[PDB]
C-alpha cells in the first residue's frame, strides 16, 4: 500500500528527471573569460567511479559579449573503435540552458600530447549541425599508437561551436568567429593524476580548425587510466539498496507497458499525455537520448536505475518531492483527495479498485481528514 505510493512516486520523479537532465558543464563568466566546471568522473569496469574535477577557461580572440552563468547538457558517445583504439568514432549532442557558422559545418582537429611520458599525435575530422546540437568525429592516432591509457581521458578534448544556445543566452563560442577562441583546461583525478590541455579554435576556408596540446602526468601505472579500466564519463551516483531496485523495477513496469525491457518515446509519451502534459515528439526523443547511456537507441532498466541513482543535493531532492506532489495534487489546493489519487494512478497505468484507493488514502492520512497534504505525502516517499 505504501509500496503503491512509492511505485507511483518514483514514476512521477522519473518523469521529472527525464525532463531535467544532470548538468554536464557549468558555465560562469569570470575575469573577462568564460569559465566552466565539470564534476563528472569516469565509470570503471568494476562499476565504481573514478572522480575527476575539470576546470576550463575559454577566451575569445576578439572582445565578445560574455553571458551570465548557465548550464550545458552534453552526451558524448563512443560510436565505434578498432581493437587497439587507434581509430575512434565519437559523437555528441550539447545544449545550453539556464552566416559564417552555417547550418552544417565540418572541422579538422590535430592533437599532440603526452601521458606519463608517452608521446602521441592524433588527427581527426568531424562534422555536425552547430545550432541543432549534433556532432561526430573520426580520430586516428598517427603517432605513438596504440595508446597505453584510457581513451576517455582524450574524448572531451576533441568542439564548443556545436552547442545549441537559446536566443536569450549569448553564444560566446559562435560569436567569437571568424577569429575564434582558445581554451585551457586542468583535470585532477582522484588518484592524483593530472592533465593540462591547451586548445585553439579557428575558422579557415569555411572549416573549423582545432589544435590541441595535452600533457598528462602522475597517473599510477596500475591505476585505472593507465590500465584501460574505464568506460566513459558519468555523474556521481548514490548506491541503491535491494529494496530500492525492487521499487524502481515496479516504477519501470508502468512505463514499459508491452514488457519488452525497454521504454520508448511512445510509452513515455503515453504516460505523459495521460498526466495531462504534452511534450513534443522532438522533446520525448531528447529525453530518451540523454539517458540512453550505451547509445544503442533504447532506454532499458539498468539505464533507468542510473537515472534514479543520480546524486542530488538536498535543495534539489526536496524540490523534486514538491514537484511530485504537485502532479498528484491536480487542482493545486494542497490536498490530494481520493479522486485526484485514483486519476493519477490510472494515468500511470495502475488500474485500482475503490477500496485500494481508500487504503492508500487511509495509510497516508496521518490527521484523518480523508486527504493527503504535503507533509503526509513526504512521510510516504
Ligand atoms: Ca516497452
Ligand atoms: Ca540503451
Ligand atoms: Ca487537491
Ligand atoms: Ca490528511
Numbering used by the authors: 39 to 136, 163 to 222, 226 to 448
Question: Can you list sentences taken from the study reporting this PDB entry?
Answer:
In addition to mRuby and RCaMP, we also crystallized R-GECO1 in the presence of Ca2+ and solved the crystal structure to 2.2 Å by molecular replacement. Strikingly, the position of the CaM domain relative to cp-mApple is distinct from that seen in RCaMP and GCaMP —the homology model used during R-GECO1 design —underlining the importance of structure determination in protein engineering. The crystal structure of R-GECO1 reveals that the relative orientation of the mApple and CaM domains is significantly shifted relative to that in GCaMP, and thus relative to the homology model used to first rationalize the R-GECO1 mutations. Many of the mutations incorporated into the R-GECO1 sensor during initial screening and selection are concentrated at the proto-interface between mApple and CaM, as is the case for RCaMP. Three residues of the M13pep-cp-mApple linker (Val60, Val61, and Ser62) make hydrophobic and hydrogen-bonding contacts with CaM, cp-mApple, and the rest of the linker. Similar to GCaMP, the cp-mApple-CaM linker is not in close proximity to the chromophore, and no cp-mApple-CaM linker mutations were selected in R-GECO1. In addition to the linkers, R-GECO1 mutations Gly79, Arg81, Cys129, Phe366, and Asn380 are in the vicinity of the proto-interface. R-GECO-1-Lys78, from strand eight of cp-mApple, adjacent to the circular permutation site, forms an ionic interaction with the phenolate oxygen of the chromophore and is stabilized in place via a hydrogen bond from Ser62, immediately following the M13pep-cp-mApple linker. No backbone cleavage was observed in the vicinity of the R-GECO1 chromophore, as was seen in the RCaMP crystal structure. For R-GECO1, no backbone cleavage could be detected in the crystal structure, however, during SDS-PAGE, a similar fragmentation as for RCaMP is visible.
